[PDB]
């Protein structure tokens, strides 16, 4: 099981090389919204995208 | 098929203790290594006398045999 | 009372608590998906699984019969002492794939209802997986003979 | 123990050895009696006696007969069934 | 084809089908000379010694203690030192030694 | 609550709001429910239910009237009644009987012509009849007949991945009780096509016109799917007939195309209830999934076009991946696929609905006859007398009850074992999963499991998995569902009010922790519950959102998990080990319950049988071994007849003992006399002793066991093993055999202990060889030898036609003789065709403990005797207190066992008395105990449920306050641990050694059955090689893995010895065993048979095959 | 647990592809959305198809 | 050539059966490689590369790799391309005369890694150098074309 995760999360990761990032998008509330292939989160900043 | 073999030779163990003049007529008579039943006057034409005295030594020598003291062993023999 | 437990198991769960609660809050703000959020909660547990093992490791007095035993190399792992005394960790569903919710408790406290249920899973899955992985060792082997 | 074997094309020389006799006629057994055919393809002078130390006529039942052939017969007494190997062959026009 | 539809079995039909001869056995024959029993652990025995049953050591070596039975006048003949053997009488012990 | 209950104190703090339920109703019910008695039918009544129908009636019902082809004549049935049983069980399994009752059921035959009316009572047969204990006796054995776990007739969608395309493929299938299948799928092309009965593919649009769906009423219904849409355009089928023709010879393809078949074959193959019928459990499946009929009564079980129209719809949905449907004139439900694991969809075949099945398929046997022979006797004199044939209705029972792979002999090993069996649930069986596609997905644990079926309890053959075993407060609903009960919770206090759930149901509320902590009112003291919600995940709710609750922390579980101690502290696989080995244990001589224990141990006892209970409250009159009998307060008088060494199934003594005596006064339902296995009506499956947990010196190494001589002195763990041997005379081609004394050419020294009849006489011991029934056989045709004729002369041997074949005790085996049963035709009793007399003989020993005999706790702890050592040589106690047993320390931590720890931590606590002090009030660690606990003499029993019991730190709080002992020091500290000394050098030990009181039981796995030897023996006629198998005398196998490893040795003539003169070789065989009795060196072997045939027919193809020696050397021989 | 069929199957080839490629090469694939650009010089011929 | 026989420590002896037993010491540790999953359910299990007793059977049975990466049939240095999709690699041989081409290699696939010690180059660059048998993306060489 956790092979199979850990090799799953390296193929993703591999996938998601070519173009990480898409676009972005502002919100009229003034925040920056970032989109692409994978979900990055700050661990020691409350998960904050 | 050992015992099969073991007992023939306890056939000429056990007639060992009859004497040859004697033993002869038992292995004529029961055909020992050739399996022809001689008749009474045929071991008398081998021998050389007449017949009824080949039924006195089968009876004497068959008497003498019946005894635990030469048949011990061949009781294992059963069938 | 050779078993012992280290008094750092406490700090560790609620440390890696609320980061769990900080990934349910940004799921339901809709930052994440559901396996996801699966995904990075078993992240989480199996970092709290590590430094609990660590922990236990550190505590234990070298001349404790539990870590003596294994030590030596006579037997066991630390893993096992770790499930023993530290707690059990994460568990896998019938498909395979690892439960969110871990099993806090350890085997010298004694497991919940709900965690022996979902133990019970993977013992069940194993008693099929032994037999079957024969199956194809006979068969590499069996060319490789001819 | 032999260490090689081989195989090659038989002559008619090695059929005509290996035989011990010809099957003149394609009877096997009588209906009635379940004994073997002369000359049929169960035949047992040439293929030997299907049972020990005695032949088809029955003259001879002893086992001292080892190397006698019946007279009426023609069936050699032998030491056992040896209808396992022993072998025959066809003079065909 | 005879009797039915089936067809007459020629000669080389005899070194063809799944039933005949230049085949080989992927299941094991069974042996005799062999026994089974449960083992424990002997710690005061040697790196090449065993600790073997007396009752299984007899059945296997059944015909050497009948030989050595009828070698020392135990018995009279194999037939008695088959029936000691089997009915496992105090002199037989001796001999399995 | 039991009367005669010991005071077993409890660690339990949780209140059970429900007793535990009869254990042994999932049997009881059924099979009242079969026979319909007045208890099953106030039962149902009470629940509502109008007019209870009990399966017999449902079965004859539904078999009547059967008309005659041209109406003139018609058969009725009616009024099932069952009379007394023929004989008791106990005579019944005395003499060989079935226990059985008539059947008798009013049959009425009806002439339309001229209004005649003929009504009887005809005699059905002798129906089997179930026991007290929910069992049955089949001729003379006692048997049990497991419930089944099926697939109910619903419908199911479920989608799958193609194999070619990778696409995801949606299917459909209608599964009826009985009748053929109706399925739907959408192709990998998105075509949408149905299959009916198995048979060819086709368009959905065809079936849709053969119910008489015009072209626009179809694109008015499926305009929303395009797919469908195009299927239509593609379908070049026009009109309802010509749909009809082609699916008639789709269906009939060697029929002629005759309209008016191809009409009604159709109509009779779905929607007419004579041949389809959908059991009235798939109705409400197929009403509650698709939304039909919401609210009103089940009327009919039949198939109509609405609800394939719906099934179609549904199908079409799930496709084109919408959530949620609502059909015209239903009500709204979910579009979703359907996992068949789900106890939603599996459902129980009881006893009686197996029974029902084959009286069902009797019946239909039946009235084939029937129909055939009215047209064949003469008008108005034919009574239901003349034509009611009742040989087909036996033969299916008595078929079922014989030759049923569900009907199986009871596993009778212990009262636990025959407990369980009772409450199996087995996947496989006829009608459930076939023998190949039991794959390892089935055999799983689904998270619907909880609560109705135990996930530790299994049996570890290859059945792991398609067996369980019944959770102790699951039922079975009148549907087959397994039920189980929950407390129902509002606002977030905990009510009384108990609701019964099925798994299906279940999944639409929040159920809460059985042990989740509340207040005396009830109310939640915390702000977050544990919960399982619809997909089984468990998860943390706030309190308001509760809905449900288990009802104890043992709902899980089943009655064999339910007997281990600390069961929290055991991993699951060990636990499964053993719950398992709990059912191999062996009654001993002298039972003793468990000091440490759980307070099932008590009630499974009783629930069980084999504990003798009073009826009546009395006193009793008179007490002996045999028999107890009692004088009830209201003047009647009741006996109870003791079964003492009677042989069990498995060949264990199930002998039982009174526990009263004369004029004690005894309540109604107490126990008055112990069973097999059980102590004052409590299980007793093994012994409580003493154990040291410390290697030494090797002799426990790798999970051996080392035993005082003192449990071989004192009989601790002796059992009494019970053996029958049989035999038979018969008829044969020579004449019949007999039973004789004097068997030929045997001495006075073999047969001294024969009887007259010529069977060994009760009490005689016997050894293996002896002989126990004389028997002889007539021979054939003699013809012998020139020798044997001289040994004939010799002895004076008469001429007797008859050669010995008595009955002899087995290789290894001996004891007493305590019992003969003889039968013979000639006395009326029943025998197997050609036989004459049958004796069956009882040998009895008492086998104590040895080396190689496996033991084993209660928490998967297992191992054999590895040495049993003297007394003085095993670890003492400072008091000189000698150990029993020693556990190697280094099986414990890597197993994950550690409850046998607390087992031995806690037994030593009760072993010796404890005392809290309360001088200075109750200490910290004593809050929770239960004021009960505060004290307690030596040799005070206590109970710790499985999920509620004794905690860490109370009993390491009471390790400290054990009393002391005689002389009044303390031996264990408070730690657990002693000083022991060294038995054989005397010295202390350096270190104290854990030391207390563990419960360890004897498994049946002992060496004296399991060693096995061969020399020479019999061999396989079909293959020539060895026979297998210890019974058969067989050898060992010597696989292809084995013969791999001796070449890598290079060992080449072992391997060539072993594969020849060892096996199939008899010339060799017979040369080798000469050469070994008379001394000669073994001979060569070479040249086997299959060479020499296999050259033969080489030379026979005209092959010129020949063997040369050497590198290109002459031939050989 | 498995039969000979089924083990025999676990050492093939077992070939994977794209799901563009795969669909690619095959004539009969039908695909869940069609975009037409410049649709107006499609004949009748290619609609059909 | 064999040398040392590895039970006794000894050279070989004329007669040993070696292949059997090297086919049995190959085939014994088969059951702790990782194998393909056991369920019938699910897609094919290509996408994600277990490598272990698949990836033998590969080797042994000398079939085409399912990750199949090129080599360099002449050593000279690299000019490398990059497109929407597909990679481009072109070897000049420096002693040698015509260049040769691969234009067809999947973008998805990473480039080698060749990361010297302190010069750490990292993913292959333009203008490196290959020698014959070089190994240009990652994933398994044929061995046909070895
Ligand atoms: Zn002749």
């Known amino acids: 099981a956790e092979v199979r995760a850990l090799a799953k999360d390296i193929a993703r990761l591999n996938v998601a090389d070519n173009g990480l990032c898409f676009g972005r998008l502002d919100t009229l509330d003034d925040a920056r919204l970032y989109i692409g292939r994978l979900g990055i989160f700050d661990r020691d900043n409350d998960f904050e995208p | 098929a050992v015992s099969f073999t073991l007992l023939q030779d306890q056939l000429q163990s056990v007639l060992e203790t009859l004497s040859e003049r004697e033993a002869g007529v038992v292995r004529l008579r029961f055909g020992l290594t050739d399996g022809q039943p001689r008749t009474l006057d045929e071991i008398g034409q081998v021998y050389g006398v007449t017949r009824e005295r080949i039924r006195q030594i089968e009876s004497k020598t068959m008497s003498k045999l019946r005894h635990p003291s030469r048949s011990q062993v061949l009781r294992d023999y059963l069938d | 009372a050779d078993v012992l437990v280290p008094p750092q198991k406490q700090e560790i769960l609620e440390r890696h608590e609320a980061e769990a609660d900080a990934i349910e809050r940004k799921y339901q703000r809709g930052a994440l998906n559901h396996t996801e959020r699966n995904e990075s909660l078993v992240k989480i547990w199996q970092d709290a699984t590590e430094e609990v093992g660590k922990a236990l490791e550190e505590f234990y007095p070298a001349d404790n019969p539990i870590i003596t035993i294994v030590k030596s190399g006579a037997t066991g792992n630390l893993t096992q002492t770790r499930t023993l005394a530290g707690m059990k960790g994460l568990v896998t569903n019938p498909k395979g794939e690892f439960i969110p919710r871990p099993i806090k408790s350890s085997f010298r406290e004694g497991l919940t209802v709900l965690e022996y249920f979902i133990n019970t899973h993977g013992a069940r899955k194993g008693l099929a997986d032994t037999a079957l992985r024969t199956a194809d060792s006979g068969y590499l082997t069996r060319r490789l003979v001819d | 123990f032999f260490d ?69 017969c023609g069936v050699e007494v032998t030491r056992a069934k040896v209808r396992r190997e022993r072998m025959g062959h066809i003079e065909l026009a | 084809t005879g009797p039915g539809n089936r067809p007459l079995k020629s000669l080389s039909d005899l070194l063809k089908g799944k039933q005949g001869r230049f085949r080989q056995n992927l299941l094991g024959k069974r042996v005799d000379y062999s026994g089974r029993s449960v083992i424990v652990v002997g710690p005061q025995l040697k790196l090449h010694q065993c600790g073997l049953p007396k009752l299984m050591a007899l059945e296997l070596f059944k015909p050497f203690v009948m030989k050595r039975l009828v070698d020392l006048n135990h018995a009279q003949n194999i037939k008695s030192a088959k029936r000691m053997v089997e009915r496992q009488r105090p002199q037989v012990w001796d001999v399995l030694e | 609550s039991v009367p005669g209950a010991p005071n077993r104190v409890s660690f339990a703090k949780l209140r059970e709001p429900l007793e535990v339920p009869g254990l042994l109703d999932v049997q009881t019910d059924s099979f009242e429910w079969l026979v319909g008695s007045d208890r099953w039918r106030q039962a149902a009544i009470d629940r509502g239910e109008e007019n209870p129908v009990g399966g017999l009636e449902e079965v004859l019902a539904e078999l009547s009237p059967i008309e005659d082809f041209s109406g003139s004549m018609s058969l009725s049935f009616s009024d099932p009644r069952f009379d007394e049983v023929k004989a ?24 339309n012509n001229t209004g005649e009316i003929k009504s009887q009572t005809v005699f059905m047969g002798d129906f089997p009849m179930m026991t007290e204990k929910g069992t049955f006796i089949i001729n003379g054995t006692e048997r049990v007949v497991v419930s089944q776990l099926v697939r109910s007739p619903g419908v199911y969608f479920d989608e799958t991945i193609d194999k070619s395309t990778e696409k995801t493929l949606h299917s459909v299938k209608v599964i009826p009780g009985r009748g053929a299948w109706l399925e739907f799928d959408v192709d990998k092309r998105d075509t949408v096509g149905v299959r009916i009965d198995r048979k060819r593919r086709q368009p959905v649009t065809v079936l849709l016109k053969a119910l008489g769906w015009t072209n626009e009423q179809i694109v008015e219904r499926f305009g929303f799917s395009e797919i469908m849409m195009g299927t239509l355009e593609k379908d070049t089928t026009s009109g309802t007939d010509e749909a009809l023709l082609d699916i008639y010879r789709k269906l009939r393809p060697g029929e002629p195309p005759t309209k008016e078949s191809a009409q009604t074959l159709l109509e009779n193959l779905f929607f007419k209830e004579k041949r389809y019928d959908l059991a009235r459990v798939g109705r409400y499946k197929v009403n509650k999934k698709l939304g039909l009929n919401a609210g009103k009564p089940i009327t009919s079980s039949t198939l109509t076009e609405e609800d394939v129209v719906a099934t179609i719809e549904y199908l079409v949905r799930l496709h084109e991946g919408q959530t949620s449907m609502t059909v015209p004139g239903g009500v709204e439900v979910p579009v979703e696929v359907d996992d068949i694991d789900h106890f939603g969809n599996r459902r129980l075949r009881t006893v009686g609905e197996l029974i029902q099945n084959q009286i069902r398929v009797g019946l239909s046997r039946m009235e084939r006859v029937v129909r055939e022979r009215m047209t064949t006797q003469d008008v108005e004199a034919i009574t239901p007398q003349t034509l009611i044939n009742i040989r087909p209705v036996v033969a299916a029972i008595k078929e079922f009850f014989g030759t049923s792979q569900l009907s199986q002999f009871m596993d009778q090993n212990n009262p636990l074992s025959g407990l369980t069996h009772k409450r199996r649930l087995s996947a496989l069986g006829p009608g459930g999963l076939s023998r190949e596609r039991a794959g390892l997905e089935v055999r799983d644990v689904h998270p619907s499991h909880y609560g109705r079926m135990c996930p530790i309890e299994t049996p570890e053959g290859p059945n792991i998995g398609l067996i369980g075993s019944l959770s102790v407060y699951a039922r079975v609903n009148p549907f087959g569902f397994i039920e189980t009960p929950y407390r129902k919770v509002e606002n977030g206090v905990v009510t009384d009010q108990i609701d019964y759930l099925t798994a299906d149901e279940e999944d639409r509320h929040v159920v809460a922790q059985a042990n989740s902590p509340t207040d005396e009112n009830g109310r939640f003291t915390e702000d977050r519950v544990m919960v399982r919600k619809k997909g089984g995940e468990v998860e943390f709710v706030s309190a308001d959102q509760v809905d449900y609750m288990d009802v104890s922390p043992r709902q899980m579980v089943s009655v064999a998990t339910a007997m281990i101690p600390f069961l929290e502290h055991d991993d699951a696989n060990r636990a499964l080990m053993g719950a398992n080995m709990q059912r191999q244990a062996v009654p001993l001589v002298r039972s003793e319950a468990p000091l440490v224990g759980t307070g099932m141990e008590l009630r499974a006892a009783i629930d069980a049988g084999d504990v003798v209970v009073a009826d009546k409250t009395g006193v009793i009159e008179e007490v002996s071994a045999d028999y107890i009998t009692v004088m009830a307060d209201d003047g009647t008088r009741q006996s109870y007849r003791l079964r003492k060494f009677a042989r069990s199934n498995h060949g264990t003594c199930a002998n039982q003992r009174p526990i009263v005596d004369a004029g004690q006064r005894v309540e109604a339902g107490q126990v008055i006399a112990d069973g097999p296995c059980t102590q004052n009506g409590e299980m007793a499956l093994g012994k409580n002793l003493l154990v040291a947990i410390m290697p030494w010196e090797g002799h426990n190494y790798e999970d051996a066991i080392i035993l005082s001589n003192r449990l071989v002195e004192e009989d601790v763990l002796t059992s009494i093993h019970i053996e029958e041997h ?163 320390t280094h099986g414990v931590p890597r197993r994950m066992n550690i409850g046998q720890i607390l087992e031995t931590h806690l037994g030593w606590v009760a072993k010796a008395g404890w005392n809290i002090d309360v001088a200075a009030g109750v200490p910290d660690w004593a809050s929770k105990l239960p004021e009960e606990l505060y004290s307690a003499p030596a040799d005070s029993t206590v109970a710790t449920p499985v999920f509620d019991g004794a905690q860490e730190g109370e009993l390491a709080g009471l390790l400290g306050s054990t009393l002391p002992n005689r002389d009044g020091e303390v031996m264990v500290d408070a730690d657990g641990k002693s000083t022991l000394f060294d038995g054989r050098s005397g010295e202390p030990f350096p270190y104290p050694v854990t030391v207390g009181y563990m419960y360890i039981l004897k498994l049946h796995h002992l060496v004296d059955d399991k060693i096995h030897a061969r020399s020479t023996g019999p061999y396989s006629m079909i293959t020539q090689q060895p026979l297998g198998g210890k019974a058969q005398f067989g050898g060992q196998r010597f696989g292809e893995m084995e013969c791999w490893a001796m070449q890598a040795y290079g060992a080449a003539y072992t391997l060539q010895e072993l594969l020849t003169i060892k096996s199939d070789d008899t010339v060799g065989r017979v040369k080798v065993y000469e050469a070994i009795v008379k001394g000669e060196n073994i001979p060569e072997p070479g040249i086997p048979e299959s060479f020499k045939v296999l050259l033969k027919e080489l030379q026979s193809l005209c092959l010129n095959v020949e063997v040369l020696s050497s590198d290109g050397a002459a031939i050989e021989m | 647990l498995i039969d000979a069929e089924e083990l025999a199957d676990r050492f093939k080839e077992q070939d994977n592809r794209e799901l563009s490629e795969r669909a690619a090469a095959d004539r009969e694939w039908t695909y869940g959305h069609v975009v037409v650009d410049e649709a107006q010089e499609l004949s009748e011929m290619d609609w059909r198809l | 050539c064999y040398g040392r026989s590895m039970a006794t420590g000894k050279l070989v002896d004329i007669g040993e059966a070696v292949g059997i037993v090297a086919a049995q010491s190959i085939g014994e540790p088969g059951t702790q490689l990782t194998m393909r999953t056991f369920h019938q359910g699910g897609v094919t299990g290509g996408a994600d590369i277990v490598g272990g007793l698949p990836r033998v059977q590969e080797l042994f049975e000398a079939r085409v790799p399912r990750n199949k990466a090129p080599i360099a049939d002449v050593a000279g240095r690299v000019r490398l391309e990059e497109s929407d999709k597909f990679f481009k690699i072109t070897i000049v041989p420096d002693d040698g005369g015509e260049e040769v081409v691969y234009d067809k290699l999947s973008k998805r696939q990473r480039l080698r890694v060749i990361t010297h010690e302190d010069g750490t180059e990292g993913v292959l660059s333009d203008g490196d150098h290959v020698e014959v048998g070089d190994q240009l993306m990652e994933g398994a060489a044929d061995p046909h074309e070895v």
Request: with cysteine; hydrophobic share 35%; net charge negative.
């Open chain 4, 4 to 72: 090689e074997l081989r195989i090659g094309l038989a002559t008619a020389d090695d059929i005509r050895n290996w035989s011990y006799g010809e099957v003149k006629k394609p009877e096997t057994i009588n209906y009635r009696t379940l004994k073997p055919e002369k000359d049929g393809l169960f035949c047992e002078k040439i293929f030997g006696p299907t049972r020990d130390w005695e032949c088809y006529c029955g003259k001879y039942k002893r086992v001292r007969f080892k190397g006698i052939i019946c007279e009426r």
């Open chain 6, 88 to 111: 008791s069980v106990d005579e019944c399994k005395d003499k060989d009987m079935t226990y059985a009752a008539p059947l008798f059921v009013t049959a009425e035959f009806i002439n």
């Open chain 6, 726 to 888: 049989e035999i038979d005379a018969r008829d044969t081609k020579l004449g019949a055999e007999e039973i004789t004394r004097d068997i030929p050419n045997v001495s006075d020294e073999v047969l001294a202990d024969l009887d007259e009849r010529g069977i060994v006489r009760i009490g005689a011991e016997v050894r293996d060889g002896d002989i126990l029934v004389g028997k002889v056989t007539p021979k054939g045709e003699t013809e012998l030898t020139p020798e044997e004729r001289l040994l004939r002369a010799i002895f004076g041997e008469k001429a007797r036609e008859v050669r010995d074949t008595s009955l002899k005790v087995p290789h290894g085996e001996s004891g007493k003789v305590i019992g003969i049963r003889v039968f013979s035709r000639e006395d009326d009793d029943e025998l197997p065709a050609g036989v004459n007399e049958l004796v069956r003989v009882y040998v009895a020993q008492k086998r104590k403990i040895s080396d190689g005999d496996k033991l084993a706790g209660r928490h998967g702890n297992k191992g054999v005797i590895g040495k049993i050592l003297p007394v003085e040589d095993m670890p003492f106690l400072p008091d000189g207190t000698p150990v029993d047993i020693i556990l190697n």
